[PDB]
Design a protein around this ligand. Structure first.
Ligand SMILES: [Mg+2]
Ligand SMILES: [Zn+2]
Lengths: 58, 581, 695, 151, 77, 226, 233
């Protein structure tokens, strides 16, 4: 809602998907390497969601 | 001015530390030498005053990193200037190939008396009008000034030619009328000229009507011209014959070359400076701009292209049934779209008026190229697919309408390849230049006159249509600036005396007399016991006079060969599916 | 920097191994690697930025999101496709229109397929389409507005340049820009956002305290004027009030080059396109003194240089105010232990911290002996080695840090004490400074006219910057003209209601119909505002004063020449353009040298700016000088001006004394070479015509 | 003629122009050497590169001696080979290849005469091209008697 | 009052070349600079500026001024 | 042929904006007059501005004052656009003190006798309950624009800090021309110049000063001849 | 607050009619104000007198030929407008020129009426072949600045009479250039150089004195708003 200041949009087509976490490339990779709580949390979230993921850490 | 360069305070003060110290001790501003060092390090005002006193009459060589050809290093008169960047004269910038996007240029200091003498005489920025590559002006760039001159010497229809069809007693009253707004700069009118105004070269045979002898070559004469052409000519020196034709870029180079040939260097520099000032002023007034309504896409485009699309989809339909092979479909579609883009290019060319800014700054030769406007207004056309292929579906939208996503992607396919090719070609060009300079050394002019008479046969005039003689299309790079080994007699009378460099007048006379070939002396046949003689090499091209003994012809030749290596950037558009052909 | 994919590295494609194929784009690089942006140097294309929607396959491949299509009906389901799985299916284009129902409006739809083919396939045959048109463009390139109208080359240069804009004193978000700058700013780590949804209790410049409803109190400390890696300030402002409610992830404090959580890499200036007296020739730039006057383009710069009190074999080094062989006033602003006070303006040569060598074997020279006897001064073994501000510098010190060996702090071996001082200045925009816009149009400032010389508009507003029109046709980036017109439109609001026009209908349905003056406007990178929209809004701009619109329907305006005073002969294009202050500042580039440090193995001057380095007279320079026939200048530039130890002192003495320059000797590098080829068992002997030679 | 025309059309394809003398100097340089054939009377090796001036000199010597001249055929080779096979070993060593040229310079015991340009840029002496020539640099200066009479 | 103040064409036609002009004017400039730095020996050989001189000047400007006036002459050994 | 001398009439459109009409000008004369008037009205007008300041416990502009959400540099930017009228030809000192929570503004600054702040509604900063702002300001008088670099003259007073100052109190000028109703081919034009200036001074005396400067320049040109 | 260096107009004369005027170092950016205002006022404000119409004997407006004269009518128009006349009647006045026989008719042979003076009798107006036959009457009228030719209906009143363009300004042209100069170690000083070309009638310096007086009046009209002081000298 109040995430950003109001900016008039000239866009014509609605976008279903939102931009992901733009820094996911580094943070998720190192999360996987450490194998800390975050990596295993994402692993179990993917498993219960059915999404494939390496379930062994780095 | 043409021989001036600006040096920020800090750089000038640091470059000239020994000289500023000597001047400070001599004027007693500083007690002793060490105190002078301390005072300059402090940077008190008297130090800057002494600096302003000491830099003048001391040349400094400005020099850019690539230094492709000998105009890379150029001497200048320094000049203190506030700020922190070198100030340079826009005329000499194109000699350096030095743009002002962002560009650093080194400053070197001639130290000895001989060194500064050389920088005064040889390397001076005003004695190098002519580029040594082919002997043409290089010190009249065109980005902005030439647009001003073109807008200045322009025929009617550039505006509503109000105040047209009248005569004015002298250019002064015409100018007054121009400020009044009744007259416009672009409007044909009859203008007087005071005595001494040398008239148009084609105006000479015509004259006024009288029963007594008259000499209009150097007295008053009315002339139907424009106020703009009057201003342009009064920029040029009085002795120069009047110019009544639009200047653009080619004719400006022509007149600059004529000035460089027939006038002294100082007059050439002053004329260039006047041309510069007027060009900037009248480009400011020219009102060239760019806007959304400036670039108007041709109306016909959409219709024609959809017609093509119909044909195209029809072809696609008869490819869906297997009636045509895929390769044949690709080739015929490529031909179809080449035809379409040629047709739309012609339609856009017809549509755009002569008064719009883009037309003014592309016709004049200021900057740009007609295909760039083609793909700004008309559709881009066929774009090369990766590893030198052609896509079947060219881009149908111009940059004004905005390309599509896949269209933008397939355009980047060629853009990045162009970048990489440019980089590789500059590397190879540098290597070639080094090799040419390194083989070409040792060849210095070490003799005034050859011992021999043997010459080289050259074709003076070719492609002579039936019942007429036509000179060679590329006569300039071949036979100009060469010395005839021996005289020529065609009607039993001598036409071109031996050992004279060739210009326009002699070439025209010899062609008119109908000779088909000439025996021009050249370095190949040169028979010199020591190196090569000056006359065999003929006149230099950066000076317009006979090559002085001892000049380095080898280095100049190698640099002239190597300079456009970066400019070539030409490659086969498509391999065509065959290798080695 | 985070998202780059450096192809260069160990066990991979090195710079030498590069060919034509690797650099060139591939049809696969769509949603996986931005083709527009890359370094333009020799490593062109080898390094590229990850696409906006890119994600990493666990095996290391890159995926991209695609929507699902079934029986001609695109669904609201997404699948992630790698570079191989994308080949089998036929993928549509997001730009393809869609009907009121979820089905395609047009049977004919653009599609792409195996091998990068772009052929069309009408009707229900596709299965996957791009989810957003900005899939193929990275963040930097996605920032540019009206990208589609620019050439690929200029968009490449504009992406490379946008990564060099320095933060300013006061940052302002673009009036016209992509709608994505908010995400780019927020996900960047510079900005400080809340981890709890509570109410702020104490707002202050240094820190901000918040209280979640649970009870936890958290205070965020805002960095203030701390040097970044590039010697630029990271000053962080505060936006939230005292009693305003907060939500998780909401933004509290801006970062460098940010505003209300929106990226702001520069300011937006009023631009008019016209040649102006040649001061903007060859793409140089003319801007008002208003920017110098109002600090519109001004950036803080913090330099940090440090010195260490190490112990040598003679003894320890002392950091003391009692530096030897100095005057009294030089050490005026120093502290007790010999440290410059905080807040004391410095200049070139000023003493930051006073350090003295322990001692050294001093054999007083006879002249020094006599002079010391005369003045009764005792030349002491302790020698001055204090830190001084390098030449060509200015600034107010903002902080000093001291670390002591004997204290609990740890230091490397030997260094008893270490001192770091911050010198911070406020560099204003000046001549020579490099400026540039978003669309790869860059130029050095060439003149800053007073506010009056600026050709002003019908209501007296001077134009803040002049740019040469000659750039845009050849540069093939008419996107900047579009941006200028839309910036003018954003600055002056517009009202569109009941106009019944096609563009009016599109604006009304989009919701961007009634826009007040000043509010920002967003044009996505590939769904920008059509030129019809710009034309219509230009017709229907809000009257700024007296009920008249200063810009004609053509998008141009009447410019009154400030100097002469007369109106310019024809209207001129004007609007608001976003410019950036690059980091290619003149102050850092400037460098001169009378005489300075010399190298060791070969006695020629050494290189670089930090060490008073003379410019290199390369091979092509001597080639050009030979081409002129100038031989004596070459002799001096090779022997007197470097590479001859005997001649340099002699020439300095002759210049200072006024005596004529002496004859050059032989260079030192030649003797280095003859000695080296003597040590390869080649008896390289220099001989004269009449027997042995004299050297 | 063929080389001049070919390279000129290659340049003109883009649109750039250069004068033909620039090309002609290089072309004369490439053609400078001659391959000796039938080296019977000349007593040197057959089938190796030899400078044109050297060829004419040795032919004059042998014909004056009464021996029949050894034949030769003009040979064209690239700029690189021409540069490497030069009389001044220092200039060639300053070119791209250093080890081989230095090695054969040592084995041949060839003294590098200082005539030319690059090697006189190595030594720091004055290049013999332009202001460095003997005839320009030997002049002496003194005003006229009337100048002193005036003052 | 400038580098280009003495125009070059007269100097070329005087000295018949351009390099010879540079070296000859350089020799003259060296001589005048040596005279100006005599500081008291008063060697009879040295000759001061023939043309008028400013209070502070470069030797080479005066040398080229003398060449333009033409009163100075050269002679190759 | 007809002789008609210029005549000036004035009208007000706002408390600080006025329009001035000069009808009998010659053809092609109004534009140049309006331009020269604008050039001198923006360049040289006498005004007052803050040239330097002092803050307790602050040694340079970079640091921050505890208790105020805007860093000192933001305070420089805020005061820099403060508009003042100073009658003392010498520098004057003003004091700004504020304790407790609230918005410190240009209204609460202490005006010395003869120096007046003219934009009291401006907001300079906001203080917290714990905060405390003390500030000394130096007001000088001049014309044009002067950067902080040349305004620094005290070195030992490390607490003092200079600020770039702007003296000109005029905001903008816009001139236009028309055609007079008199029936002649000359078509004498009516120059109308609209001046809007800051709250410091009425535009009337601003243009009075501009006219004084220009008339003095042209009188210098005239009298030195003949 | 006071100007660092006061200006001082100075003159440089190369011909009796051509002149150059230099202003010493001046406040920054003031060069263009003074330069262009001076140009326009010097070109327009100074009053003068020049011909307004010409009448040839025995010709029609459409009939561009004149019998008995080798030259045509348009060159005659150029020549007459070239000629300078000093008049003070404040109303239209007429001048006559009647000459016969072959020869050359010049401004010297023109007979001026009372109170009108021709300044340059050297100009040759026309050349005659055979019988000159020339009879001519031209109208002079004082005025200000510059005005283009218009129809007054004089042609309808008399067929021979035709309009002609006029040069009321005593000056022919002003070319002003502003350059930079360095004073007290500061380069923020602009020198104005104004080159004034004027006809032989009136000296340029007096003309610019009149122009400066006019500008002084026109800008001191602004003193009436209020009394204020600005730094000077
Ligand atoms: Mg560049
Ligand atoms: Zn020869």
């Amino acid at each position: 809602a109040s995430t950003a200041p109001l900016r008039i949009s000239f866009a014509k087509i609605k976008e279903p998907l939102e931009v992901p976490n733009l820094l996911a490339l580094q943070t998720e990779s190192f999360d996987w390497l450490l194998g800390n709580d975050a990596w295993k949390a994402r692993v179990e979230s993917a498993l219960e969601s059915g999404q494939d993921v390496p379930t062994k850490s780095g | 001015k043409l021989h001036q360069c600006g040096l920020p305070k800090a750089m000038a003060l640091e470059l000239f530390k020994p000289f500023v110290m000597k001047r400070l001790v001599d004027l007693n501003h500083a007690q002793n030498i060490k105190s002078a060092k301390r005072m300059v390090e402090r940077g008190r005002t008297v130090v800057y005053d002494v600096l302003e006193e000491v830099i003048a009459e001391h040349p400094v060589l400005l020099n850019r990193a690539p230094t492709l050809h000998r105009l890379g290093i150029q001497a200048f008169e320094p000049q203190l200037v506030e700020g922190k960047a070198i100030q340079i004269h826009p005329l000499v910038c194109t000699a350096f190939n030095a743009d002002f996007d962002g560009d650093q240029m080194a400053v070197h200091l001639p130290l000895s008396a001989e060194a500064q003498a050389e920088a005064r005489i040889l390397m001076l920025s005003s004695n190098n009008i002519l580029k040594p590559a082919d002997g043409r002006p290089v010190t009249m760039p065109t980005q902005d000034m030439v647009l001003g001159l073109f807008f200045l010497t322009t025929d009617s229809e550039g505006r509503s030619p109000k105040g047209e069809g009248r005569a004015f007693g002298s250019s002064a009253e015409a100018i007054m009328a121009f400020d009044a707004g009744d007259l416009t700069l672009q409007a044909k009118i009859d203008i007087r000229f005071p005595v001494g105004t040398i008239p148009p070269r084609g105006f000479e045979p015509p004259a006024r009507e009288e029963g007594e002898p008259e000499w209009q070559q150097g007295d008053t004469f009315t002339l139907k011209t424009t106020l703009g052409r009057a201003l342009f000519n009064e920029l040029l020196p009085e002795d120069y014959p009047f110019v009544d034709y639009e200047v653009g870029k080619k004719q400006l180079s022509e007149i600059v070359n004529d000035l460089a040939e027939r006038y002294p260097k100082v007059i050439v520099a002053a004329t260039l400076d006047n041309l510069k000032a007027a060009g900037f002023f009248w480009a400011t007034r020219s009102g060239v701009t760019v806007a959304i309504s400036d670039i108007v896409v041709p109306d016909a485009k959409k219709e024609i292209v959809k017609g093509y699309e119909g044909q195209d989809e029809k072809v696609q339909k008869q490819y869906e049934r297997g009636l045509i092979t895929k390769e044949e479909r690709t080739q015929e579609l490529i031909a179809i779209w080449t035809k379409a883009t040629n047709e739309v290019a012609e339609a856009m060319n017809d549509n755009f008026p002569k008064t719009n800014p883009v037309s003014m700054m592309v016709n004049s030769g200021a900057r740009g190229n007609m295909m760039q406007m083609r793909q700004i207004a008309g559709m881009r056309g066929l774009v090369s697919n990766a590893k030198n292929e052609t896509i079947p579906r060219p881009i149908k939208a111009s940059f004004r309408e905005g390309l599509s996503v896949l269209e933008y992607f397939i355009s980047t396919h060629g853009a990045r390849k162009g970048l990489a090719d440019t980089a590789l070609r500059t590397a190879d060009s540098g290597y070639l230049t080094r090799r040419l300079v390194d083989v070409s050394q040792d060849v210095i002019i070490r003799e005034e006159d050859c011992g021999t008479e043997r010459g080289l046969k050259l074709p003076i005039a070719t492609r002579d249509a039936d019942g007429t003689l036509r000179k060679a299309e590329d006569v300039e790079t071949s036979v100009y600036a060469r010395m005839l080994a021996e005289d020529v007699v065609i009607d039993g009378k001598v036409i071109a005396p031996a050992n004279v460099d060739l210009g326009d007048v002699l070439i025209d006379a010899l062609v008119a007399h109908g000779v088909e070939e000439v025996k021009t002396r050249s370095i190949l046949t040169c028979e010199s016991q020591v190196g090569t003689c000056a006359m065999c090499y003929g006149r230099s091209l950066a000076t317009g006079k006979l090559v002085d003994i001892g000049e380095a012809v080898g280095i100049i030749a190698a640099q002239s060969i190597g300079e456009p290596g970066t400019q070539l950037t030409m490659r086969t558009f498509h391999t065509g599916g065959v290798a080695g052909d | 920097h985070k998202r780059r994919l450096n192809a260069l590295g160990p066990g991979g494609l090195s710079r030498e191994r590069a060919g034509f194929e690797v650099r060139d784009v591939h049809p696969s690089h769509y949603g996986r690697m931005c083709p527009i942006e890359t370094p333009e140097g020799p490593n062109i294309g080898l390094i590229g930025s990850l696409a906006s929607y890119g994600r990493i396959n666990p095996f290391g491949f890159i995926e991209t999101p695609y929507r699902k299509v079934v029986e001609g009906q695109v669904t609201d389901d997404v699948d992630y496709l790698t570079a191989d799985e994308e080949d089998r299916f036929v993928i549509a284009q997001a730009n393809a229109a869609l009907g009121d129902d979820m089905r395609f409006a047009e049977a004919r739809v653009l599609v792409r397929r195996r091998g990068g083919e772009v052929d069309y396939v009408p009707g229900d045959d596709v299965d996957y389409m791009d989810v957003s048109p900005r899939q193929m463009v990275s963040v930097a390139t996605a920032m540019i507005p009206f990208l589609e109208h620019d050439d690929a080359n200029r968009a490449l240069m504009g992406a490379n340049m946008m990564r060099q804009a320095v933060p300013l004193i006061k940052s302002e978000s673009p009036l016209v820009g992509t709608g994505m700058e908010y995400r780019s700013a927020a996900d960047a780590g510079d900005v400080v956002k809340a981890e709890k949804a509570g109410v702020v209790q104490e707002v202050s410049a240094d820190y901000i305290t918040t209280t979640n409803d649970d009870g936890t109190y958290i205070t965020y400390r805002l960095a203030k004027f701390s040097r970044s890696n590039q010697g630029t300030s990271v000053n962080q402002k505060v936006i939230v009030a005292e009693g305003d409610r907060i939500i998780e992830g909401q933004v509290l404090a801006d970062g460098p080059a940010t505003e209300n959580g929106e990226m702001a890499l520069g300011k937006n200036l009023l631009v008019a396109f016209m040649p102006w007296e040649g001061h903007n020739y060859e793409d140089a730039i003319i801007l008002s003194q208003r920017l110098v006057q109002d600090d519109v383009l001004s950036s803080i710069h913090i330099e940090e240089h440090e010195v260490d009190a190490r112990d040598t074999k003679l003894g320890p080094e002392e950091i003391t105010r009692d530096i030897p062989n100095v005057s009294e006033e030089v050490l005026a602003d120093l502290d007790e232990r010999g440290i410059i006070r905080i807040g004391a303006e410095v200049v070139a040569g000023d003493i930051l911290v006073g350090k003295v060598t322990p001692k050294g074997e001093t054999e007083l020279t006879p002249e020094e002996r006599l002079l010391r006897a005369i003045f009764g001064e005792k030349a002491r073994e302790v020698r001055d080695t204090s830190l001084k501000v390098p030449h060509g510098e200015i600034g107010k010190v903002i902080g000093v840090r001291v670390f002591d060996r004997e204290e609990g702090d740890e230091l490397p071996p030997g260094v008893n004490q270490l001192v770091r001082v911050y010198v911070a200045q406020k560099r204003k925009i000046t001549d020579g400074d490099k400026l540039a816009g978003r669309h790869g149009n860059k130029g050095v400032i060439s003149k800053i006219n007073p506010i009056e010389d600026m050709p002003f508009l019908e209501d007296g507003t001077p134009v803040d910057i002049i740019l040469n029109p000659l750039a845009v046709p050849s540069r093939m980036n008419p996107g900047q003209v579009l941006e200028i017109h839309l910036g003018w439109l954003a600055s002056r609001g517009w009202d569109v209601s009941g106009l019944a026009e096609e563009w009016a209908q599109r604006l009304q349905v989009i919701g961007a119909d009634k826009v007040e003056p000043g509010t920002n406007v967003a044009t996505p990178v590939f769904d920008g505002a059509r030129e019809d929209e710009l034309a219509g809004l230009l017709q229907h701009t809000i009257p700024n004063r007296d009920g008249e619109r200063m810009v004609l329907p053509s998008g141009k305006a009447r410019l009154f020449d400030g100097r002469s005073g007369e109106p310019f002969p024809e209207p001129i294009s004007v609007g608001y353009m976003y410019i950036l202050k690059l980091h290619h500042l003149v102050d850092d580039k400037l460098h001169a040298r009378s005489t300075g440090p010399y190298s060791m193995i070969t006695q020629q001057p050494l290189g670089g700016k930090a060490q008073f380095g003379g410019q290199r007279f390369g091979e092509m320079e001597v080639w050009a000088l030979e081409a002129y026939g100038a031989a004596y200048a070459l002799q001096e530039l090779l022997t007197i001006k470097s590479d001859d130890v005997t001649g340099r002192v002699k020439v300095y003495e002759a210049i200072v004394k006024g005596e004529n320059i002496p004859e050059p000797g032989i260079p030192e590098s030649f003797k280095v070479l003859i000695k080296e080829m003597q040590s390869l068992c080649l008896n390289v002997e220099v001989l004269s015509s009449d027997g042995m030679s004299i050297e | 003629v063929h080389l001049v025309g070919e390279v000129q059309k290659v340049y003109n394809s883009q649109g750039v122009s250069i004068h033909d003398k620039h090309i002609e100097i290089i072309i004369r340089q490439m053609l400078r050497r001659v391959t000796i054939i039938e080296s019977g009377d000349a007593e040197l090796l057959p089938g190796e590169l030899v400078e044109r001036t050297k060829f004419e000199t040795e032919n004059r010597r042998v014909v004056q001696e009464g021996g029949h001249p050894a034949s030769g055929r003009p040979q064209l080779m690239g700029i690189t080979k021409a540069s490497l096979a030069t009389e001044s070993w220092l200039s060639a060593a300053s070119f791209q290849e250093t080890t081989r040229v230095l090695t054969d310079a040592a084995i041949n015991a060839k003294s590098d005469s200082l005539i030319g340009l690059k090697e006189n840029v190595i030594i720091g002496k004055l290049i013999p091209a332009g202001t460095g020539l003997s005839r320009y640099r030997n002049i002496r200066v003194e005003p006229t008697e009337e100048a002193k009479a005036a003052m | 009052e400038g580098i280009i103040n003495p125009p070059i064409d007269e100097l070329l036609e005087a000295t018949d070349s351009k390099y010879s002009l540079v070296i000859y004017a350089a020799k003259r400039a060296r001589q005048i600079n040596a005279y100006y730095s005599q500081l008291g020996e008063g060697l009879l050989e040295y000759v001061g500026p023939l043309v008028d001189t400013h209070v502070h000047e470069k030797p080479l400007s005066i040398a080229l001024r003398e060449i333009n006036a033409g009163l100075l002459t050269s002679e190759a050994i | 042929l007809i002789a008609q001398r210029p005549s000036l009439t004035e009208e007000v459109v706002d408390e600080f904006r006025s329009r001035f009409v000069i009808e009998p000008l010659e053809p092609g004369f109004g534009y140049t007059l309006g331009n020269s008037l604008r050039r001198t009205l923006l360049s040289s007008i006498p005004g007052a501005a803050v040239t330097s300041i002092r803050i307790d416990g602050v040694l340079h502009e970079f640091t921050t004052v505890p208790g105020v959400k805007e860093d000192v540099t933001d305070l420089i930017l805020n005061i820099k656009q403060l508009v003042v009228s100073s009658e003392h030809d010498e520098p004057v000192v003003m004091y700004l003190r504020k304790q407790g929570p609230g918005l410190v503004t240009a209204a609460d600054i202490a005006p010395p006798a003869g120096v007046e702040v003219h934009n009291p509604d401006l907001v300079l900063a906001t203080l917290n309950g714990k905060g405390k702002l003390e500030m000394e300001l130096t007001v000088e008088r001049g014309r044009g624009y002067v950067s902080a670099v040349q305004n620094k003259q005290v070195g030992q007073e490390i607490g003092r800090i200079p600020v770039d100052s702007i003296y000109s109190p005029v905001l903008k000028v816009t001139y236009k021309v028309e055609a007079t109703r008199v029936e002649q081919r000359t078509d004498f034009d009516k120059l109308i110049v609209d001046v809007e200036t800051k709250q410091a001074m009425r535009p009337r005396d601003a243009m009075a000063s501009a006219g004084k400067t220009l008339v003095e320049l042209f009188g210098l040109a005239r009298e030195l001849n003949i």
